[PDB]
Amino acid sequence: FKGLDSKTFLSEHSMDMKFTYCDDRITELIGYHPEELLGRSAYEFYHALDSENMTKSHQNLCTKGQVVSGQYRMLAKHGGYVWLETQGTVIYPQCIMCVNYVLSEIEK
């Protein structure tokens, strides 16, 4: 069992969803080192079944300035996926801030 903060990680992105920063909390949760995500688009890690929905959410974020994603699956470093949900916020555009909350253990 984990407390709330230990299942939360913040990430920062350019407007094309490439990672420009990520909290080290992600390593313990999903396996990645922040350094290795920099320059990769968040879209590389969304499950195929959530990809169209996450495109729509990104469009909604860009139009409205803030968005909640709904539940989706992110690819873990060592295979499998975790469920998570994300609050996104555009900062002026300069960048996208995402507060990511893990909803499940890694699932194959």
Binding site: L4, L10, Q66, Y92, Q94, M97, Y101
Partner: protein, 112 residues
């Protein structure tokens, strides 16, 4: 393009830094440990301190929207650098734990 110099921080609702992104070193010249546990207002120019306090107080009232503020931040070289801090609250609704404030702090120009 020239990338803006910025770093992320987390604050409690009083203004205390509870997390500091290491990009602070390049932005303002402090190590994260020099900011952690201090109030942001301790780095703010006296003329701007009340605005900055006011800002932190209002961001909690604005239903998670972004609230920005410009102020003068004392760098490690003791020079006043213009900062734009864009703040919003995060509260995880699976809980009733108190919200905290997420900031993104960018060195900006005080000019058009």
């Amino acid at each position: 393009v020239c990338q803006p110099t910025r770093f992320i921080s987390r604050h409690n609702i009083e203004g205390i830094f509870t997390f500091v992104d290491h990009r602070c070193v390049a932005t303002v010249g402090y190590q994260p440990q020099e900011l952690l546990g201090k109030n942001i207002v301790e780095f703010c120019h006296p003329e701007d301190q009340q605005l900055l306090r006011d800002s932190f107080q209002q961001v909690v009232k604005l239903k998670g929207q972004v609230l920005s503020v410009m102020f003068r931040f004392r760098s490690k070289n003791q020079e006043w650098l213009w900062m734009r801090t864009s703040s919003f609250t995060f509260q995880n609704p699976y809980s009733d734990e108190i919200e905290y404030i997420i900031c993104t702090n960018t060195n900006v120009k005080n000019s058009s």
